[PDB]
């Protein structure tokens, strides 16, 4: 659910 996970 967080950023930077594509």
């Amino acid at each position, epitope marked *: *659910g*967080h*950023a*930077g*996970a*594509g």
Partner: antibody
Amino acid sequence: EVQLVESGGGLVQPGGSLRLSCTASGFSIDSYGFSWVRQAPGKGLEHIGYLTAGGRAFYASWAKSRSTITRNTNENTVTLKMNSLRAEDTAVYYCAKLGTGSRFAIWGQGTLVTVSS
Amino acid sequence: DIQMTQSPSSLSASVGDRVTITCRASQSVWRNKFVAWYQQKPGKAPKRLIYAIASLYSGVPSRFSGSGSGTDFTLTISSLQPEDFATYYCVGHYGSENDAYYAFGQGTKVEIKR
């Protein structure tokens, strides 16, 4: 049950490097993304970088040139390395899942790194 | 870079007062939702009170409430109590599908008026 035990740091000479690690207990270090934060004496909180749960590290513009954040799944740890330290890098450094949009938040106890000759 | 600002930086209030601390991010936060409010007292580590704008964590008194959207957020203490005098920080998550960042506000120190 759950804890984040921080270790390392102390004294560093100008131009030297610091190495801080945090061992997770009660959960797996790969399950979440973890940040590194510092607070200089009598100043506010400052974000250094973030290691996503996927294992990708991203840094604040000011710390990118000197900082390296890694993790060790075998030992269940996350580590911060900063070289080329200066006097203004003196601060209490924290490892933490900040939990800005999720329920799980946890911080290390913090450790003082004094950069001085 | 990404920068967050809180208003005010310092404020003096009395027990029972209503306190409102604002926080604006230079850009919209991740999912217009990833903002948490922390509480820190002298010589102690920061303590998270609110996450995802308005979600209250287990054990946090209900007098604390969070609101806002995207770039602007507000911490509200309905009735200020003695244990609430401290420094409050807003922290936001940012990034894309390919990068991720966090940022803190400068902090707001709530001191007791006398």
